[PDB]
Amino acid sequence: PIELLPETPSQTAGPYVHIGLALEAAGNPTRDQEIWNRLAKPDAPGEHILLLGQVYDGNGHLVRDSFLEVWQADANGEYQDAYNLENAFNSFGRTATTFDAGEWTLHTVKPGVVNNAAGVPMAPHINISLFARGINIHLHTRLYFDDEAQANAKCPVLNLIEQPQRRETLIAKRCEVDGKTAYRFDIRIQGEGETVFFDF
Amino acid sequence: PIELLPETPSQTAGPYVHIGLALEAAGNPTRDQEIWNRLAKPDAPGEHILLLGQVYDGNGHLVRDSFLEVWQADANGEYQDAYNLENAFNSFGRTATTFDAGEWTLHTVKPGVVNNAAGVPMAPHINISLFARGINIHLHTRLYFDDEAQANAKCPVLNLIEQPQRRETLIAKRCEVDGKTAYRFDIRIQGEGETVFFDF
Amino acid sequence: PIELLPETPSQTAGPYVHIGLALEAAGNPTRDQEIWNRLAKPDAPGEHILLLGQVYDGNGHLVRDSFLEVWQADANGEYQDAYNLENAFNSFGRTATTFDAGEWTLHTVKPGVVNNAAGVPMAPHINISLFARGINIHLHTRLYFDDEAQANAKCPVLNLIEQPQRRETLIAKRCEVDGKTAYRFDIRIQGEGETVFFDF
Amino acid sequence: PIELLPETPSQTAGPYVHIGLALEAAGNPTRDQEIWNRLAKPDAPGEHILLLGQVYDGNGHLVRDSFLEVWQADANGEYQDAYNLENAFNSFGRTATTFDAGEWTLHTVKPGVVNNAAGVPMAPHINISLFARGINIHLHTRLYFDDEAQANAKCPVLNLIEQPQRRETLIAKRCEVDGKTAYRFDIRIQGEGETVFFDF
Amino acid sequence: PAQDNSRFVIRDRNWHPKALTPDYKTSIARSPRQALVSIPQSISETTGPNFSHLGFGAHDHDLLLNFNNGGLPIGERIIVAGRVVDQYGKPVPNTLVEMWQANAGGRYRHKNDRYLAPLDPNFGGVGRCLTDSDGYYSFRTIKPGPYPWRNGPNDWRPAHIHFGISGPSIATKLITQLYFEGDPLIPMCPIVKSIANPEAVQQLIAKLDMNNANPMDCLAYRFDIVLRGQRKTHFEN
Amino acid sequence: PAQDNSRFVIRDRNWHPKALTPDYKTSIARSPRQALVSIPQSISETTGPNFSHLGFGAHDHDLLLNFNNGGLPIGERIIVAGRVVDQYGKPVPNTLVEMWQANAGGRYRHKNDRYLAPLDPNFGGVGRCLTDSDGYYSFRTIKPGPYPWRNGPNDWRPAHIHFGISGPSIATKLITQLYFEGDPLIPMCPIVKSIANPEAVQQLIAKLDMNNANPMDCLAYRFDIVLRGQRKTHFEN
Amino acid sequence: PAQDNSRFVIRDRNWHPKALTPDYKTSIARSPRQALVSIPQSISETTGPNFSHLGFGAHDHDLLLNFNNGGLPIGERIIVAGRVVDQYGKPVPNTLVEMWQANAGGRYRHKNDRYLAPLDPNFGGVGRCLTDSDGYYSFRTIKPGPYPWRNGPNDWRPAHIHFGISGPSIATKLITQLYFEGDPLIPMCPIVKSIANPEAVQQLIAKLDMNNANPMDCLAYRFDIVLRGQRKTHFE
Ligand SMILES: [Fe+3]
Ligand SMILES: [Fe+3]
Ligand SMILES: [Fe+3]
């Protein structure tokens, strides 16, 4: 068969990933421009939300050295790839769990609906890639919202998860933090309540 | 050492096993004669019973595409191998779980006692072979009966299972279905309450 | 793919084939029973015929060391495989061309119609195999009759010969020899008028 | 020595070439635009002519499945390579022999004189490529005209054919079809009168 | 009734695929985590059904004719034939061989198959037969197509026919899959690769069999099946 | 109008099949017995049609859609794609690639084909396209079946697609046949074997191309085509 | 205004390291036990950030100058350079390449690293670059030292530099580690050996590149990166 050049293989990010990719979270000096966890300035259109979560290993213990990358549509359901710290909104961000702060946070807006390649709407979601010591190749997941039940029930990606019970692992829980709308999305890498991870 | 011709290797039966081995269960038209789940004609000797059960995977979720073959002595402890739809009793049958009917059923008689090769009586039992998508080589088990406690305690096959708690996985529970004597035999392929599986 | 034992390869019969297979034609003493050119005793049913012919090489010169084997149905369209010199008719015979007698002869009856494997009638024919010095593997042909024009036109074997002109090479010419019905069938191995040879 | 990438090897076009390259000739439905046998619109410059011919195998039998491609200068000696069904003249066309129409036809104009690479005029000619079942790599030839005898005698390509008698195989015969000027160009692939075929 | 008169050679469960083969994703949750419990052969294991008295239809072995809705199925006409023997080389006569497959496009006639390749109105995909007195079986069918399946993001089954063979006891019963000589999908398939030993994989590949072909009609493939060796009991009790 | 500005590398007629290849029986009477006459390249040979202005239909390259009589064809859905280059490795852009084939069962939609395998009412078997500015072409089709033919008493063509490629001149024009990776019929075919050099045969075998497949939809095969090398004229006259 | 116009060749997850690789002890509890769920590519997966207008500092790619506290760092001066291409051999221009590493003695500038090898007051260990229009990147740094880690009782990482590459979409994003030609620690490392195929391990070993060296100044190593092949959608 046709064999292309093989892809460079993945390796774990390791315990010090933060010195290269999360300088502030590492307690080290930052450069003038950093890619971080504030996707939306206050003036950006749409519903402003706080996302937060904790990451658990297979023994139910906190992962305190996680690094997370997120990719989401704007409130109007468009992906904004031209990354610029002057933008009111950027579709891409980074966050982390650390020893000081075991709970990651993101400041964003709720993403609008986007269609799949066959033109069927997907429920509002945030794409997440999870890196850490012990993770040899990053894990892909999606964060959906518990107040989009009707859309979630019809999502063609959610519906590829064979068991309903496993679908529940991707649904973030609405709450309020300091009077502001927030959603909690905990990730369990292994075992009871194991979060659905994707290949694509 | 002496090496014989190798056996043809097993492969999973896959998700469409019913089109070949359970045509009625597949909702496809049947041929004039099919090997199915009614072992006993109404006037066959012995105690007429219903067997039924569900099959669970390692996540506790129903296996909705399993295919089962059974082999049992008749009520007089004889194996009737000359398969024939005109027989009052066939020792062999087939059943299945499907999307519509997640619970398999078998109509038979309670089997009589047979001796092992050393002449020791075995407790009444049904030999079962389980096939499905995800099962690379079929799993062997035995269904024994909870109202044969004295015989079960003395069975030389049950006594080969080192732990009493695992012996309990092979004991079907007496119940009533539509007012008729029945025994329920659930199979757990993996994890908590995992059913004992045999090699011979 | 599946490969069977290979067939023993053919070799030419060579110039002295007659000492082994045509003893009389070789001018050598015969044994008590020989397989030769009289397929029909006078009492055999059907139309008694003389067949004769000459064999030509690619330069138009006579082949004077040919050996021919023939196989034909009886007048009723049945092949008689139980070869016996006491039979009124045998379906099999042998003839030859020699230096003394360049023209072979056969004494037979006109064969009846036989169907092909799909049940379609073939026109009356004699199967012929030709052997000689210079012929590494024998050549198969058929002799048909010029007074069976209607049957010949519909023969499914004749009709596999793509060109009408080549079909004419297999049609023997009726004549009279000493007041008796005869047919002449000359074979041209190579070049102008080349006789159709078959593979099967 | 310097060895380039090898050319993809030729294979016969086979008996069903018309379904791909001569759809109307195959009696199958045509697409909106097909490359076929009318090179000249009625108002194209030059002398409008019909070309036609038959193709013979080595046994003198008609080739009833041939496919032909032609390439010729226009009447002013120009090769019109921008193929377009709206052109007054196309230098390229296709034609075929079939079971129904054993004689190919081409509607064109008489081509004007073009010079060879050394600047010597070639006699008016049509370049022809012949494909068919049994032809493993297509055969190149040229059709010249019998009423251009002076030019033909001086053609540097015709003069590369060592024997005058073989030069005669490339000269089409002027005739009339339905009262119109025509030239007949029969091709004999093999044997007596074998048409000259070119390599370049 | 059946008697305990024979013993079957123990299975090599490193020649067969193991239960847990994670690249085949459905095996991860449908594989036992405890060891199998070994038990001695008794009459329960060394006997099994014989199907000599099962009534077979005329076309049960002929998939070109057994789903006839006004015409022939579309696809590559093939005979699939072979012999069933045990590990000692003894033929296994009068044994039930069942088979099922997709159509020429990789579509199964099952409600759960939603692949966009069309059903063939003259093809059902199911056959059975009994081996003859010398162990030989034969079916006539069309060659099934590969098809995509939700394992990895671009996984395709090689063309295959599912087989089930009864043999002389429940100890011999086997389900497997036949694949076709030279199919470049075979080395890439996680179900094929559930078999760790490449020599064992080779045993599932049917060979083109020109000798059994019907000229101008259908090709043929040969697939021989080996069941557990059967011997008489000796020196017991 | 066209100009004489290039020369084409001379063909290796021991790499191509020779004319007389008697095992392929129809070649015996359709092969010239006289030598070909070599002639120098002129404008007549170094020019040829360009089909940039030919009007192609929407589905001309898509055999799954271009014979649509109410449904999809039955059979193995495949993309057949590749690149056309010359012997110097230069892409050949805007060139005409035409193809035809049998259906999934080895039956052609031609009156002369009487093979008993049925026609597919949604399959015609004909495609064309122009290579893009980088030399690439693609078709979507179903994989054709082998079929029997009246050569030897049990001869079968391997599965194949017929191709015709124009290239930059009449000197480059080529007709060939594409075969499929691993088909055990390829070594047995007298038409394949008209090519004496086994390395040349390999150049006609399309490779399975999982990278170009559409998951859950169609597989893909890659077939690259090399036409005669083109160079500028130099030091002439 | 990102659009779905491309598909990416599916990953070979037997070429990459598997999740569960027990000799690398931390993978035992941080590996999913359920199968990954395959999903079709959509605009969500086939797009991603472009960092063309991220504002880079003058020394962001030069680790000999980007932690300047009065002198040069101690250690082997090297240039680390290469090309980022996809599996079709197409270069990947204007893509973000980030890297981090320990100092010459195997010590990282992170509070959780308490290895007794000292920090270097003129070294920080962090770089970033965008590939140029032909897919090339380059950093200047010091060769990192190996270092011990609490896996087995005497386990040591080979000298290595951590790398992250964005590529054209979130589907191509990759984190990996670069190792150095000839290092005898490479075959012993359970993190290297998380990669089962030895030919894949070879793809992470940077080669000494004398052609790129500055005589009398610094050596150079070459590390080419291949991301997933990108093709146009067809017949969807
Ligand atoms: Fe299947
Ligand atoms: Fe063909
Ligand atoms: Fe490190």
Which is catalytic among the residues F16, F77, F83, F162? F162
Minimum Cα–Cα distance from F18: chain D residue: D136
Q: Which of C193, G14, D100 is closest to E193 using CA atoms?
A: G14
E strand or H helix that includes residue B52: strand B48-53
Q: Which ligand has its closest atom nearest to the C-alpha of F113?
A: 2
What the block records as the tokens of F48 is 């040829």
What is the C-alpha to C-alpha distance for residues E27 and F11, in angstroms, rounded to an integer? 56
Residue-wise burial string across D75-106, b where 16 or more C-beta atoms lie within 10 A, e elsewhere: bebbbbbebbeebbbbbbbbbbbbeeeeebbb
What is the C-alpha to C-alpha distance for residues G137 and D60, in angstroms, rounded to an integer? 72
DSSP three-state, residue D150: helix
Q: Which of F226, F122, F205 is closest to F160 using CA atoms?
A: F205
Sign of CA dihedral A49, A54, A55, A60: negative
Question: Catalytic site residues of G?
Answer: 108, 147, 157, 160, 162
DSSP three-state, residue B160: helix
G118 CA from centroid of ligand 3 (Å) = 16
Q: D with B: 3 or more CB pairs under 8 Å?
A: no
What is the C-alpha to C-alpha distance for residues F63 and C139, in angstroms, rounded to an integer? 46
What is the C-alpha to C-alpha distance for residues A90 and A37, in angstroms, rounded to an integer? 10
What is the C-alpha to C-alpha distance for residues E112 and E115, in angstroms, rounded to an integer? 9
Residue-wise burial string across G105-126, b where 16 or more C-beta atoms lie within 10 A, e elsewhere: bbbbbbeebeeebebbebbbbb
Specify the DSSP class assigned to residue D112: P
Q: Which of D192, D152, D198 is closest to D174 using CA atoms?
A: D152
| CB contact at 8 A, G39 and E153 | yes
Burial bucket for residue D152 (CB in 10 Å: 0-12, 13-18, 19+): buried
| CB contact at 8 A, E9 and E87 | yes
Minimum Cα–Cα distance from E30: chain G residue: G34
Sign of CA dihedral A38, A41, A42, A48: negative
Q: Which domain holds residue D56?
A: 1-200
What is the C-alpha to C-alpha distance for residues G194 and G16, in angstroms, rounded to an integer? 8
What is the C-alpha to C-alpha distance for residues B138 and B55, in angstroms, rounded to an integer? 14
Chain E residues touching C1 at Cβ < 8 A: 181, 207-210
What is the C-alpha to C-alpha distance for residues C86 and C98, in angstroms, rounded to an integer? 27
Q: Which of G181, G187, G126, G182 is closest to G156 using CA atoms?
A: G187
CA distances from D195 to C192, D186, F147 (A): 21, 9, 34
The values of phi and psi at residue D168, to 5°, are: -60, -25
What is the C-alpha to C-alpha distance for residues D69 and D128, in angstroms, rounded to an integer? 6
What is the C-alpha to C-alpha distance for residues D95 and B5, in angstroms, rounded to an integer? 61
DSSP three-state, residue B174: strand
* The CATH classification of domain G1-236, taken from the options 3.90.550.10, 2.40.50.140, 2.60.130.10, 3.20.20.60: 2.60.130.10
Instruction: Annotate E22-79 with DSSP letters as a single string.
Output: TTSGGGTTSS-SSPPEE----HHHH---B-TTS---TTTTBTTTTT-SSSPPSS-EEE
Measured between CB atoms, does D18 come within 8 Å of chain F? Answer: yes
Instruction: Annotate F47-97 with DSSP letters as a single string.
Output: ---B-TTS---TTTTBTTTTT-SSSPPSS-EEEEEEEEEETTS-B-TT-EE
Number of domains, chain D: 1
Other beta carbons within 10 Å of C17: 19
What the block records as the tokens of G130 is 């965008």
Listed in order, strand segments (DSSP E) in chain C are 48-53, 55-56, 67-72, 92-96, 104-109, 114-115, 121-122, 125-131, 139-145, 171-177, 180-184, 187-188
What is the C-alpha to C-alpha distance for residues F69 and D47, in angstroms, rounded to an integer? 45
Query: What kind of experiment solved this structure?
Result: X-ray
Question: What's the CATH code of the domain at B5?
Answer: 2.60.130.10
Across the strands, what pairs with G139?
G80
Q: What one-letter code names the amino acid at E138?
A: S
What is the C-alpha to C-alpha distance for residues E112 and E92, in angstroms, rounded to an integer? 35
Q: What length is written for chain D?
A: 200
The values of phi and psi at residue F26, to 5°, are: -65, -20
A188 CA from centroid of ligand 1 (Å) = 34
Minimum Cα–Cα distance from E170: chain B residue: B71
3-state secondary structure A88-121: CECCEEEEECCCCCCCEEEEEECCCCEECCCCCE
Distance between alpha carbon E169 and the CA centroid of its chain, in Å?
17
Domain residue ranges in chain F: 1-237
Q: Are strands G174-180 and G219-222 parallel, antiparallel or unpaired?
A: unpaired
What the block records as the tokens of D146 is 């019998």
CB contact under 8 A, D5 and F88: yes
E strand or H helix that includes residue B165: helix B164-167
Burial bucket for residue A122 (CB in 10 Å: 0-12, 13-18, 19+): buried
Per the annotation, does G61 bind a ligand? no
Chains C, E: CB pairs < 8 Å: 13
Minimum Cα–Cα distance from B119: chain E residue: E237
Å between F10 CA and nearest CA of chain D: 7
What the block records as the tokens of E55 is 């009534």
- Residue for token digits 């005979």? E79
What is the C-alpha to C-alpha distance for residues A160 and A123, in angstroms, rounded to an integer? 13
Distance between alpha carbon A130 and the CA centroid of its chain, in Å?
8
Measured between CB atoms, does F83 come within 8 Å of chain A? Answer: no
What is the C-alpha to C-alpha distance for residues F156 and F177, in angstroms, rounded to an integer? 15
Measured between CB atoms, does E196 come within 8 Å of chain G? Answer: no
Å between F233 CA and nearest CA of chain E: 45
What is the C-alpha to C-alpha distance for residues E38 and D50, in angstroms, rounded to an integer? 89
E strand or H helix that includes residue C17: helix C17-21
Measured between CB atoms, does E152 come within 8 Å of chain G? Answer: yes
What is the C-alpha to C-alpha distance for residues B188 and B57, in angstroms, rounded to an integer? 6
For G10, the closest of E23, E26, E153 (CB atoms) is: E153
CA distances from G42 to A92, A141, A200 (A): 17, 14, 9
Q: Are strands C92-96 and C67-72 parallel, antiparallel or unpaired?
A: antiparallel
The values of phi and psi at residue E212, to 5°, are: -100, 0
* The CATH classification of domain E1-237, taken from the options 3.40.710.10, 2.60.130.10, 2.30.30.30, 2.120.10.30: 2.60.130.10
Q: Which ligand has its closest atom nearest to the C-alpha of F106?
A: 2
Burial bucket for residue G134 (CB in 10 Å: 0-12, 13-18, 19+): exposed
| CB contact at 8 A, F86 and F230 | yes
Chain A residues touching G29 at Cβ < 8 A: 57-59, 61, 134, 189-190
What is the C-alpha to C-alpha distance for residues E123 and E100, in angstroms, rounded to an integer? 11
Chain D residues touching F229 at Cβ < 8 A: 4-5
What is the C-alpha to C-alpha distance for residues A97 and A95, in angstroms, rounded to an integer? 7
CA distances from C98 to C24, C132, F163 (A): 11, 11, 55
Distance between alpha carbon C6 and the CA centroid of its chain, in Å?
28
Q: Within the 10-29 window of chain E, which residues sit less than 8 Å (CB to CB) from chain G?
A: 22-23, 25-26, 28-29
Side-chain half-sphere CA neighbours of A103 within 13 A:
9
- Resolution of the model in angstroms: 1.8
What is the C-alpha to C-alpha distance for residues E129 and E132, in angstroms, rounded to an integer? 9
Listed in order, strand segments (DSSP E) in G65-186 are 77-86, 96-100, 126-130, 136-142, 147-149, 155-157, 160-165, 174-180
Which is catalytic among the residues F24, F137, F147, F179? F147
Side-chain half-sphere CA neighbours of B108 within 13 A:
26
Binding residues of E for Fe cation, as ranges, are 108, 147, 160, 162
Burial bucket for residue C179 (CB in 10 Å: 0-12, 13-18, 19+): exposed
What is the C-alpha to C-alpha distance for residues D179 and F92, in angstroms, rounded to an integer? 45
What the block records as the tokens of E147 is 């098809």
Q: A with D: 3 or more CB pairs under 8 Å?
A: no
Chains A, G: CB pairs < 8 Å: 265
Chain F residues touching G236 at Cβ < 8 A: 214, 217
Question: Catalytic site residues of E?
Answer: 108, 147, 157, 160, 162
